[PDB]
Amino acid sequence: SAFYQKHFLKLLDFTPAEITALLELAAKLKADKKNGIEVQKLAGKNIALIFEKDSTRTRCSFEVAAYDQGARVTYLGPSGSQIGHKESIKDTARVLGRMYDGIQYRGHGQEVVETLAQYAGVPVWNGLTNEFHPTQLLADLLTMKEHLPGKAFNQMTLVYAGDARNNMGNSMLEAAALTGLDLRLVAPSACWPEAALVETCTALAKQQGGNITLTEDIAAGVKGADFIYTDVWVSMGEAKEKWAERIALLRDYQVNSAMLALTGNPQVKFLHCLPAFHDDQTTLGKQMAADYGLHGGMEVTDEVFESAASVVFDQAENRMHTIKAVMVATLSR
Amino acid sequence: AFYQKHFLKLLDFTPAEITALLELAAKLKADKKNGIEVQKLAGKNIALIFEKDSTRTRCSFEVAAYDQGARVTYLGPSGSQIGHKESIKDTARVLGRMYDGIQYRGHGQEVVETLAQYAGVPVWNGLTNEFHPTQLLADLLTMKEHLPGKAFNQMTLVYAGDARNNMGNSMLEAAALTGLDLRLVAPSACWPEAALVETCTALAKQQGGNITLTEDIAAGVKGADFIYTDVWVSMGEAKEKWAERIALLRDYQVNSAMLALTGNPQVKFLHCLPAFHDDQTTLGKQMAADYGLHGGMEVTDEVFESAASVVFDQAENRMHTIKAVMVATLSR
Amino acid sequence: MSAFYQKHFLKLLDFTPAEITALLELAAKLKADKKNGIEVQKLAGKNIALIFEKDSTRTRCSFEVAAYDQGARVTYLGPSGSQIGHKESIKDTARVLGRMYDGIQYRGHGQEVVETLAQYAGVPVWNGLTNEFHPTQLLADLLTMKEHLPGKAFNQMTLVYAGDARNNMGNSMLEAAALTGLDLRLVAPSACWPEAALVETCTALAKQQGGNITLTEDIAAGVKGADFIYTDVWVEKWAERIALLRDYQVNSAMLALTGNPQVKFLHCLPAFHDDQTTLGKQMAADYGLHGGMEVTDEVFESAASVVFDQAENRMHTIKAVMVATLSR
Ligand SMILES: [Br-]
């Protein structure tokens, strides 16, 4: 169980038994705080948080985890020039490494984070890159374990519905490759991940006791699901015209009550990394209902999001406990 | 009995509770001045939501937190305001799972009301369009310190300028709870909503006070123990809107002649800040050249710098009263 | 040492040589204490405001980490909206912050700003960089020079700054020689020399301490016998400054001309040495600056380069300033 002074760049750098140990430490740390017996292992330690792109949830998780454990943080938010434009990453890592005990990087390509790791001389943790999002996956795996206790991940069935090509989709293939989940990607074929990545993650997951299924057939795809998972269909970085065709393509794949009933599982739980477009009284939600008929929600309805099946807020809380585990395990012995 | 309650506006409390809160601010001010502050918020994490910037409010919350042993996460203005893309409810519930208390500053009172309904932890209004309670906490403690022998219902407070805003609304609230003799000295298009005026005037009268709205400066300021003002213009509004507000309000500039009109040599000057009193700042120079505003705008440099002016006691007191709010609501 | 309590740190010339030496010995103490896990926090209960009117990741991290190690808390007030003095007066800013904070760092625009904050704050104000002076960097550099050239007093050392010196870095070089007796050479084009009255003031003070200050376009004469070589980034308009300054690049040839194979290289950072960066590929492609700009990557990564010790020592010296001016 030695993560000490290791990096945390992507969940694939670890074995199933290590991810399990990291999750058990997070559950202990979580329980420790709930019971007011939290032992700080990071008193004296200073952490730098590089954010080349904004994410509040990920910042607050790193900040609160550090504070609970007694560390102090410097938040280095977006400043324009990405590292490697004007100044080499080599140079950034060696200056921060002299000064900080640990470095979170959230931003662009995995090549960036991997270079920062090689030169910092201190643990580097990936809060998100274009390619991998291991803190979010950790948090999802901990939530899944808490609500379906006593079952290995290869005793579980996960549905991810909607657009499986985006960065959260690839994380699902990563999750099943390492844990052996029974994974079902319920999406229109235009939004399927690259077939090569699919062939290769299925083999890894098959060898781990699970499978990966890609299908446009919702009623078949979701049978037996323990958890349904979705994310937003569109991006504020594209125009109105792009939204129209994404919504027409994907609206049939909305997680709604009828989808959940198609599972045949009365204890199915619902997951969403957030932010979620479920409330049609927001400014954007009122436009989407008026323009596209999306009353009651988009990728997930308000009824499901607010139902007892929804654990999205346990899931968000767990960002913090899992990130705390990463930092305690890589910075203290 | 502020434990786990919110701080959204002054009239969510009784006079005796506000009095209890002011005496706590005084104790925590004295404890820090004497070097014997007791950290009550150690282990607490606080989130500061700033949809609009205000360094005075940010620093007051940061230093009070830090003095009490807490840690803070400052969420500055960032893209789309809460409730545009993501539900207020969702922001509330995610923050509440991670933080022990939340400060909000930005837009409508309904935003901070929703945050408080769904966060599960105390939520403190650091300023909305409609109310600004922590500022008025500081002003009341400042007033008590500078007239320590008088009760609030023995004091006369003039607020001059434009009162159709969160400051005018909060003056009314404060008068309702303390019995102040409150004069809003302003043009008639600049008075707060009649309904709120009516409600607070009846309450002020029961606490031994009054609320008078008038365009008549000389009668308005007669007897003032304190004169209070704020800037006439918000940055980012059109040039025509600056020129119409200046034309309408410049007669209500707090200047030496207005202080003299009180007949009170002891009269003191308050201003929530920032203030436009210095015609040598870059903006001061543009307003002096364009509108003739030499000597300052809503208040003159002479008044601002004079012994009458207690604006920086008032700024410090932002921190101490905000500390009492957090201490009172986060610990028992 | 309590002679420092409640003082400002606006520029080196506000101090005596003995006082500068006191701040360095404290910096070395605090650095050795950290290395050994025996740092004693002097700043518990203290809150510090960092006014950054211009971005500087190195200066900010140094101040934050120094604060945190000593048990203080910080409020980073970075760039947002209008600068101090545009809408609100410097004085007003100083008097509000001074009521809530135990000290104020300022970084950004002119020296009159930091000086007005210090006049009115009522608490210690530290200059983290103005257009005219950059004293915390020079402290870090002085400590770095003493560490890598141990058995020598400052007035027995020869330091060269190469590049553009008509700015806060040349000005502060002048200050450091005036306070320590360095044998200081500024090796730069004639259009890149600092103001003459500062040169004159500092040249005498330096002579009273056993050193000299020399300004020359002549590189071989300028860098002869140097113990250290220092430079900084030179920067259309870009093109005016490159052609003017590229012959003053610090490369293997320039260090050879010192005749001192123990010469060390200093750079305040950030540095343009890597020609594989987005900017570095554009500068090689468009101006023929292969292998770097004001310092070649060969010098930058050589055993002669001590830039990352210099950078760490930003923190230790900023720590010493804040400990000496805040704790009685
Ligand atoms: Br902190």
Side-chain angles (χ1 to χ4, degrees), chain A residues 1-23 25-71 73-81 83-84 87-110 112-164 166 168-193 195-237 239 243-333, chain B residues 1-84 86-234 236 238-332, chain C residues 1-235 238-239 241-328:
Chain A
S1 321
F3 295 74
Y4 180 69
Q5 292 292 301
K6 253 57 182 211
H7 302 301
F8 193 76
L9 301 188
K10 70 199 200 219
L11 213 56
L12 286 165
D13 292 340
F14 301 99
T15 71
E18 295 164 11
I19 286 163
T20 294
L22 207 57
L23 294 164
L25 168 60
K28 168 77 183 171
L29 292 175
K30 169 180 227 193
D32 275 18
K33 185 176 187 179
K34 157 87 162 17
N35 299 312
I37 48 143
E38 175 153 25
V39 168
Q40 342 190 294
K41 307 297 204 197
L42 316 180
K45 277 154 162 43
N46 305 295
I47 298 169
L49 314 180
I50 298 169
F51 283 72
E52 304 206 280
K53 300 143 76 193
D54 270 317
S55 179
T56 298
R57 277 145 273 277
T58 280
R59 185 196 166 185
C60 296
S61 297
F62 270 95
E63 296 215 3
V64 161
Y67 297 151
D68 283 340
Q69 281 294 304
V73 319
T74 301
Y75 172 70
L76 302 173
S79 292
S81 61
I83 56 194
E87 186 174 19
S88 83
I89 304 172
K90 242 185 167 191
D91 293 0
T92 301
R94 296 182 288 184
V95 176
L96 301 175
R98 296 259 187 147
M99 232 150 259
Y100 291 90
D101 299 288
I103 308 176
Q104 181 283 167
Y105 170 86
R106 180 266 204 270
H108 308 312
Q110 192 81 8
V112 173
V113 74
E114 264 156 14
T115 295
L116 214 54
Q118 192 192 335
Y119 293 96
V122 297
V124 176
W125 322 294
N126 176 14
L128 170 61
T129 46
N130 298 333
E131 294 87 0
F132 301 101
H133 196 15
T135 67
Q136 186 66 63
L137 262 192
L138 252 183
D140 304 340
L141 295 168
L142 171 60
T143 304
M144 281 160 72
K145 226 297 177 186
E146 289 177 333
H147 286 93
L148 208 53
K151 275 151 165 169
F153 290 136
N154 61 19
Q155 289 183 282
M156 292 178 204
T157 299
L158 176 53
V159 169
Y160 182 93
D163 172 57
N166 73 7
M168 262 285 99
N170 279 1
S171 304
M172 293 294 118
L173 298 166
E174 164 158 308
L178 276 152
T179 55
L181 296 154
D182 183 12
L183 166 61
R184 280 80 162 284
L185 273 60
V186 171
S189 45
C191 307
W192 287 2
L197 190 47
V198 171
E199 167 84 327
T200 289
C201 285
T202 318
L204 286 176
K206 259 161 177 164
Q207 280 260 5
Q208 266 293 144
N211 193 37
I212 305 186
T213 307
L214 262 69
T215 171
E216 299 193 324
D217 187 348
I218 291 155
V222 312
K223 282 292 172 307
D226 290 301
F227 302 94
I228 301 174
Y229 200 128
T230 190
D231 200 351
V232 167
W233 301 329
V234 296
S235 72
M236 311 306 305
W243 282 49
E245 92 187 70
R246 310 227 74 235
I247 279 165
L249 174 70
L250 286 157
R251 60 190 303 162
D252 297 334
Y253 293 81
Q254 145 192 104
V255 177
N256 47 37
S257 285
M259 181 179 290
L260 268 68
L262 289 169
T263 65
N265 177 4
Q267 293 310 313
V268 66
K269 303 291 139 44
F270 170 73
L271 299 175
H272 197 303
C273 51
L274 301 177
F277 297 166
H278 63 94
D279 186 330
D280 66 14
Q281 268 164 221
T282 68
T283 301
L284 180 63
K286 269 183 275 230
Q287 178 179 27
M288 293 300 98
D291 286 3
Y292 300 96
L294 289 163
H295 299 272
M298 288 186 57
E299 73 274 7
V300 58
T301 59
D302 204 52
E303 183 176 45
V304 166
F305 188 89
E306 294 304 345
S307 79
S310 179
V311 294
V312 302
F313 294 116
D314 293 335
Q315 181 190 354
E317 183 179 337
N318 285 333
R319 295 290 310 280
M320 188 280 281
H321 305 294
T322 52
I323 280 165
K324 191 184 296 183
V326 172
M327 288 191 306
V328 167
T330 64
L331 294 175
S332 60
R333 272 207 271 205
Chain B
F2 294 73
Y3 186 74
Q4 281 302 295
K5 306 309 179 82
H6 311 287
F7 190 69
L8 305 184
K9 74 167 81 89
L10 292 180
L11 287 172
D12 285 348
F13 305 90
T14 64
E17 301 167 344
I18 294 284
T19 292
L21 203 54
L22 293 170
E23 291 174 330
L24 177 53
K27 180 191 139 243
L28 299 176
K29 177 186 196 155
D31 287 359
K32 164 173 194 160
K33 178 149 219 159
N34 301 138
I36 200 172
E37 172 151 25
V38 175
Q39 291 191 322
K40 300 299 184 196
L41 302 189
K44 299 296 164 53
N45 305 303
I46 289 164
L48 308 173
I49 300 174
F50 279 72
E51 313 212 81
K52 284 176 227 185
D53 277 327
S54 160
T55 297
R56 292 138 294 277
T57 299
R58 172 176 179 198
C59 295
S60 297
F61 268 90
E62 287 215 20
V63 168
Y66 294 144
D67 285 347
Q68 282 294 311
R71 283 85 64 214
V72 309
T73 307
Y74 168 69
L75 299 177
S78 82
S80 57
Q81 60 187 272
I82 281 65
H84 185 273
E86 182 163 34
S87 177
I88 298 150
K89 320 219 204 77
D90 290 0
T91 288
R93 289 176 288 187
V94 167
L95 286 177
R97 293 290 190 109
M98 243 171 248
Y99 289 102
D100 305 290
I102 311 173
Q103 180 284 164
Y104 180 83
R105 194 201 183 264
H107 304 282
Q109 187 74 10
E110 67 273 17
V111 171
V112 79
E113 282 171 0
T114 307
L115 280 179
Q117 196 182 344
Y118 289 90
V121 293
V123 173
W124 316 294
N125 174 2
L127 175 141
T128 57
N129 300 337
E130 293 89 342
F131 299 101
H132 195 15
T134 68
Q135 183 65 59
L136 272 286
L137 280 202
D139 312 330
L140 291 167
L141 174 70
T142 300
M143 286 162 161
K144 210 64 151 77
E145 285 170 337
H146 281 271
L147 287 184
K150 250 179 185 155
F152 286 134
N153 60 3
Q154 290 171 314
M155 299 181 184
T156 302
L157 162 69
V158 165
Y159 178 94
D162 171 14
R164 194 163 188 84
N165 51 41
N166 43 33
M167 287 304 285
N169 294 347
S170 296
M171 293 283 153
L172 298 174
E173 281 206 312
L177 282 153
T178 60
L180 285 164
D181 172 359
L182 174 65
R183 295 85 174 281
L184 305 192
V185 173
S188 45
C190 295
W191 296 346
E193 276 292 57
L196 182 59
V197 172
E198 177 179 23
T199 289
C200 297
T201 306
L203 294 164
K205 271 171 62 194
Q206 290 294 333
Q207 297 309 308
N210 259 289
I211 300 174
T212 309
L213 285 49
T214 178
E215 313 192 328
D216 184 350
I217 299 180
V221 305
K222 219 64 36 167
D225 289 292
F226 305 93
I227 293 177
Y228 198 130
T229 194
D230 196 12
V231 295
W232 307 322
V233 287
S234 44
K239 185 96 177 135
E240 57 152 22
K241 186 81 108 215
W242 279 53
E244 106 184 291
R245 293 207 274 255
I246 290 162
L248 175 73
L249 292 161
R250 59 192 305 156
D251 290 331
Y252 295 84
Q253 164 187 92
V254 180
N255 53 35
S256 299
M258 187 195 272
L259 299 212
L261 282 172
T262 75
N264 177 13
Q266 295 316 85
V267 67
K268 303 300 181 49
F269 174 71
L270 299 157
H271 189 310
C272 52
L273 304 178
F276 299 156
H277 57 94
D278 181 334
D279 62 9
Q280 299 302 126
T281 68
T282 303
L283 180 75
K285 276 187 229 274
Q286 170 187 322
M287 300 291 109
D290 292 359
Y291 304 101
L293 290 167
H294 312 269
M297 318 205 346
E298 73 275 3
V299 64
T300 66
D301 199 56
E302 187 190 338
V303 169
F304 188 87
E305 293 300 345
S306 78
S309 178
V310 305
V311 296
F312 300 114
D313 296 338
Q314 184 190 354
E316 178 186 340
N317 280 338
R318 288 299 305 285
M319 189 275 281
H320 296 305
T321 49
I322 274 166
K323 186 184 290 189
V325 169
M326 296 197 297
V327 166
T329 57
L330 290 176
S331 87
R332 241 181 323 200
Chain C
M1 185 74 52
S2 70
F4 285 96
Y5 181 60
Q6 285 306 301
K7 277 194 175 194
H8 303 298
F9 187 75
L10 306 178
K11 55 172 178 67
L12 297 179
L13 290 159
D14 287 351
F15 296 91
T16 66
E19 276 162 0
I20 297 302
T21 291
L23 289 177
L24 292 177
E25 307 208 73
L26 177 59
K29 159 169 176 48
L30 289 167
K31 175 175 172 166
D33 290 355
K34 184 162 189 207
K35 167 106 148 194
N36 294 327
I38 59 179
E39 187 163 356
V40 173
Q41 308 191 146
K42 300 289 150 98
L43 302 181
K46 274 152 207 322
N47 303 308
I48 290 160
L50 313 171
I51 304 161
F52 276 68
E53 297 212 293
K54 276 157 122 199
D55 268 13
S56 177
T57 317
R58 294 132 272 99
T59 301
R60 181 202 172 174
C61 290
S62 289
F63 262 97
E64 299 214 353
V65 172
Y68 295 147
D69 288 340
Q70 280 293 303
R73 303 289 85 100
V74 319
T75 300
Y76 176 81
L77 305 178
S80 208
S82 52
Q83 56 197 262
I84 281 146
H86 168 274
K87 201 164 53 186
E88 184 170 33
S89 69
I90 304 159
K91 301 143 82 302
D92 287 3
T93 297
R95 283 176 299 182
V96 166
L97 294 177
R99 295 292 191 110
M100 335 204 155
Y101 290 94
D102 303 284
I104 300 154
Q105 185 272 182
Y106 176 89
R107 174 172 210 289
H109 293 299
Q111 180 82 11
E112 95 263 1
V113 180
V114 83
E115 269 162 10
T116 314
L117 292 168
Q119 182 170 355
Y120 292 91
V123 296
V125 177
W126 317 294
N127 174 8
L129 176 140
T130 57
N131 299 332
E132 294 85 4
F133 295 100
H134 193 13
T136 66
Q137 182 67 55
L138 266 298
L139 277 185
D141 308 331
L142 285 175
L143 175 67
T144 306
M145 291 180 290
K146 201 63 106 110
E147 292 174 331
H148 287 273
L149 197 55
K152 281 200 152 57
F154 279 136
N155 59 43
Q156 310 178 303
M157 294 189 187
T158 297
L159 162 72
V160 162
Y161 180 89
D164 186 357
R166 180 155 199 68
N167 53 31
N168 47 35
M169 284 303 290
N171 290 355
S172 295
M173 294 290 142
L174 300 177
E175 289 206 300
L179 273 281
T180 63
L182 285 170
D183 175 23
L184 166 73
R185 295 86 179 267
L186 306 173
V187 172
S190 193
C192 307
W193 290 359
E195 293 291 281
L198 183 49
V199 174
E200 164 154 78
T201 300
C202 285
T203 285
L205 281 161
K207 286 191 200 257
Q208 295 166 251
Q209 298 298 314
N212 193 22
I213 291 162
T214 300
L215 277 64
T216 190
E217 299 170 293
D218 180 351
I219 298 164
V223 317
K224 178 127 66 61
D227 297 291
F228 297 87
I229 298 286
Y230 204 128
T231 194
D232 198 8
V233 164
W234 303 322
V235 57
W238 275 56
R241 283 173 229 152
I242 290 148
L244 177 55
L245 283 163
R246 55 188 302 155
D247 300 331
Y248 293 79
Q249 170 183 101
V250 181
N251 48 34
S252 305
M254 181 186 272
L255 280 51
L257 281 142
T258 66
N260 170 16
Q262 250 48 66
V263 68
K264 297 300 199 303
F265 173 70
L266 295 155
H267 195 319
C268 54
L269 300 176
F272 296 156
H273 62 94
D274 204 314
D275 66 10
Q276 296 302 293
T277 54
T278 289
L279 183 62
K281 290 202 205 105
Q282 165 186 137
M283 295 289 99
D286 302 2
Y287 298 77
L289 298 168
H290 321 263
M293 303 201 226
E294 74 287 343
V295 63
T296 51
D297 186 62
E298 171 174 47
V299 172
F300 191 81
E301 301 291 358
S302 73
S305 172
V306 298
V307 296
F308 296 116
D309 296 334
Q310 185 183 3
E312 185 186 323
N313 286 347
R314 293 299 305 290
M315 191 274 274
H316 302 294
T317 54
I318 277 149
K319 194 183 272 169
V321 165
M322 291 195 314
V323 166
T325 56
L326 298 180
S327 40
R328 207 177 335 169

